[PDB]
Ligand binder design. Structure first.
Ligand SMILES: Nc1ncnc2c1ncn2[C@@H]1O[C@H](COP(=O)(O)OP(=O)(O)NP(=O)(O)O)[C@@H](O)[C@H]1O
Ligand SMILES: [Ca+2]
Ligand SMILES: [Ca+2]
Ligand SMILES: [Ca+2]
Ligand SMILES: [Ca+2]
Ligand SMILES: [Cl-]
Ligand SMILES: [Mg+2]
Length: 476
């Protein structure tokens, strides 16, 4: 049953690994905490109901004022390649692993409070996050999960009137991030490149036993684990590409060891399709552009593989990395076939998908709404309506014919079954930047109605909701 805040059970596994992997650090509170928004689904991971998130004590805990005695807040140490260049020392500069909760299902869940204050790893930073940062990370975490895209989760956002300077005067907020691990590729890189072989093995054994235990029985457990990580990453990137999620900062310290989306900063969901969109205004070379996310993910896996060379041969590691691209293409094509309402794999499907994207590229076509409208009517009628959005309208007619011929080349069910199949994987509502911005503006004025409704709508992004037509609109 849903329990009280005082009934949470803690089992702080990572804290017990010692001071070589993290440092005990308490949060620095922020003033006048208020609950901005909370996720019922995320809270359920901790056996908590939404009503427990409305308690003053709840806002106090996740703004740094109070903390269970059974917790042990810790700042992790890690490193990472940042935009291709190795940085020998990063770590939790503005967040803390408060502890790990053991829920009734028998699962361990990290409680990471992001924006909790300065730590030994903050360097010159203030250890804070501003309200717009916390709200965007909360919305994207839970929107991705509702979409079926593996992601770190977010339980709540808590506001404050603690001043924080960025470009202008802003105010500190914290987001409670939940995940079953906060270990990153960069966690292993740090121990590898500082040549701490005992601790590197202890961390790899922690990841192995807690998250890939089936691999322990195999002749080379760390090779099997690496293969599983490569698989999870291929599935993750396939979902990003299929649904137009741009991360923006795919540094190796932001690659989760579990294959979940991690660290939401300058992300963006594509509005108009653009295979080369650069969502990060600081990514001057386009290293983390939409299309580059595929080769970058492979590069990051090679960087992870380096940290495992003490245990696995270079040849075996590089052979495993070679599985990434075919696995990505398999899952990507599967996802895009489903977005097109197709239910079997046929030889030229990759060309069909590729041709659709090239037609979208310079025609100003909304990625999400194209696939939703494609399924909302029989293909012939939907395509006649979508015709006008394309510049090369006669090339599109040829693609539309190829698509209708592809439908006819398989048993595709009734028109109604097709509609339900496609609307079950094609969202009507997505976390568009302009929608998040409107929620942020209202919240910065003290009005949290908008951010809450937007979050609510995205909990069921595939289901039409009455009166929410504004959330299905293209950007104005
Ligand atoms: N305001 C800040 N104060 C202190 N450290 C910071 C601050 N902003 C970023 N950092 C650190 O700078 C590095 C790069 O930040 P980034 O990759 O954006 O991660 P993050 O969003 O700060 N936290 P996380 O989501 O857990 O990766 C990390 O080691 C951060 O902890
Ligand atoms: Ca970040
Ligand atoms: Ca085009
Ligand atoms: Ca257009
Ligand atoms: Ca039929
Ligand atoms: Cl920030
Ligand atoms: Mg980061």
């Amino acid at each position: 049953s849903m329990k009280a805040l005082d009934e949470l059970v803690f089992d702080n596994r990572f804290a017990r690994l010692g001071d070589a992997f993290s440092t005990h650090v308490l949060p620095e509170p922020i003033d006048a905490p208020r609950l901005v928004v909370a996720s019922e689904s995320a809270l359920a991971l901790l056996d908590l109901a939404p009503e427990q998130s409305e308690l003053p004590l709840f806002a106090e805990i996740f703004s740094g004022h109070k903390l269970w005695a059974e917790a042990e807040p810790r700042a992790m140490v890690y490193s990472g390649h940042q935009f291709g260049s190795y940085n020998p020392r990063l770590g939790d500069g503005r967040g803390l692993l408060l502890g790990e909760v053991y829920n009734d299902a028998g699962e361990h869940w990290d409680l990471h409070l992001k924006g909790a204050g300065r730590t030994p790893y903050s360097r010159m930073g203030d250890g804070r996050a501003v309200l717009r940062s916390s709200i965007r990370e909360f919305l994207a975490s839970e929107a991705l999960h509702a979409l079926g895209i593996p992601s770190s989760r977010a339980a709540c956002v808590v506001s404050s009137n603690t001043p924080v300077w960025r470009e202008k005067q802003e105010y500190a907020a914290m987001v409670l991030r939940l995940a079953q691990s906060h270990v990153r590729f960069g966690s292993l890189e740090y121990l590898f490149y500082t040549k701490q072989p005992e601790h590197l093995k202890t961390l790899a054994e922690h990841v192995l036993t807690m998250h890939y235990p089936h691999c322990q029985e195999q002749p080379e457990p760390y090779l099997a684990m690496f293969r599983e990580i490569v698989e999870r990453n291929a599935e993750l990137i396939a979902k990003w590409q299929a649904y137009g999620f741009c991360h923006g900062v795919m540094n190796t310290d932001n690659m989760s060891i579990l294959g979940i989306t991690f660290d939401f900063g300058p992300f963006a969901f594509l509005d108009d399709f653009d295979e080369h969109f650069i969502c990060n205004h600081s990514d001057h070379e386009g290293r983390y552009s939409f299309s580059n996310q595929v080769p970058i993910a492979q590069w990051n896996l090679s960087a992870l593989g380096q940290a495992l060379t003490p245990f696995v041969s270079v040849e075996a590691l590089r052979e495993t990395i070679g599985l990434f691209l075919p696995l990505y293409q398999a899952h990507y094509l599967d996802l895009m076939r489903r977005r097109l309402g197709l239910t079997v794999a046929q030889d030229q499907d990759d060309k069909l998908v590729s041709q659709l994207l090239q037609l979208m590229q310079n025609s100003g076509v909304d990625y999400t709404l194209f696939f939703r409208r494609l399924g909302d009517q029989p293909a012939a009628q939907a395509l006649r309506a979508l015709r006008d959005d394309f510049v090369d309208i006669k090339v599109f007619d040829d693609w539309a014919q190829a698509y209708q011929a592809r439908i006819a080349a398989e048993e595709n069910g009734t028109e109604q079954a097709r509609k339900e199949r496609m609307h079950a994987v094609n969202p009507l509502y997505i976390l568009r930047n302009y929608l998040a911005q409107n929620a942020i503006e209202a919240a910065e004025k003290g009005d949290y109605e908008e951010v809450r409704r937007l979050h609510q709508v995205l909990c069921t992004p595939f289901t039409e909701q009455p009166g929410m037509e504004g959330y299905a609109q293209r950007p104005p």
